[PDB]
Design a protein around this nucleic acid. Sequence first.
RNA 1: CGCCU
Length: 454
Amino acid sequence: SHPHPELGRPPALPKGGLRVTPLGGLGEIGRNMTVFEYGGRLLIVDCGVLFPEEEQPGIDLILPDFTSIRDRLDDIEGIVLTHGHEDHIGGVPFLLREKPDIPLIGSKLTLALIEAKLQEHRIRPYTLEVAEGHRERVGPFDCEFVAVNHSIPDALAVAIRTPAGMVVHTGDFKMDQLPLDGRLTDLHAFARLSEEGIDLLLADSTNAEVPGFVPPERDISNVLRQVFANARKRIIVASFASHVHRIQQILDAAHEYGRRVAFVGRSMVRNMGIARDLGYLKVPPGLVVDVKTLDDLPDSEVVLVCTGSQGEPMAALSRMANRDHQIRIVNGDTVILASSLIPGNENAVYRVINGLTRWGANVVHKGNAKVHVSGHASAGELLYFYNICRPKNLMPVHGEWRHLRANAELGALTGVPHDRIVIAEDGVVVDLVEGKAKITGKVQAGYVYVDGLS
RNA sequence: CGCCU
Ligand SMILES: [Zn+2]
Ligand SMILES: [Zn+2]
């Protein structure tokens, strides 16, 4: 039930067929990249990086292998960016380095983030900003964009129409029914699409092993308020620099309890800068201040929103825990790790927590408080979703093998036929011919290591 | 289940 060990190169793509090829995100979560082919032309959905398990000198980032598209960069009609996370957009500078006039298609915030990253590489891309509801033709690919709710604002699924049929790519999504910005995952859109006919659905598998439903983000507010209410000294909150809604809730609590907020960390400052700038983050006047002024403030009036929720040794939280930061942890400080614990980072995270605890901090985290909810649909949501989309072929994407198999089983339960559910690996080539999806070959899709110069 | 600088 896996791809055949020796799959040759794929045959010619039949006239009228579509060819889908995950170059990343399958078997190992990250460096997500999917290549769509129709009539010799290529559409790329996401191009991200993957963060290495260790691996110290000479290995900063891991990219998708561009081998199967490098000899045909001229065929690429565009790169669609479903949302602004690094394992979806982090690879773009290394792809554009090889052909800089490939157009980036994406939401406003998505584009602003990727443009910020590209600036550091001296690259200015051609872009096409889209919003939910926009429909646009990109070479042979007719792209309609659909709102999805998630850990970052402004994320899109995309429905791609060709004469091979309609392919829906969900990007990353969950289904919060009470999102901070009122922006729901557009089930109306999906239902309409489903009545037109969804021939191949590529769906987020990240949380498919998890039963039930993701608690709504707004529940976190309660916990934050409890923590804030009982915190007699400074509060330090760590989160991913892109989690705008999370941070929104931290400012909300800060305001409620008469505290001032300062952002610490390059990424955090940059991103909250962009989010605030474009209206995604709503900040009441007088709340946010420079970190330098925090010295002048009483402890009980101070909230630091900083960086390094995954124990990244160069980030704020870690250096604080290692007594190597301008900010010095003291007995009585409250630290909240308002984040996930990505598998593999347990050593680093726990080391940070132990350091913090050692210096006298009370540390709130997902292990002792409900201060984080997943960004991805659980088994419950996925069932809701499959019952609305009713895909005719299903490809689980974005997960380790256990995740994909889970997602596959859910699809099965909703009535997707087993022979129409295809589990792929990086480099496995799926052809949508005559409305059926079949594994037809595989291409080179190993790992590629980069130091910023590759 | 996405870094960080
Ligand atoms: Zn994401
Ligand atoms: Zn992702």
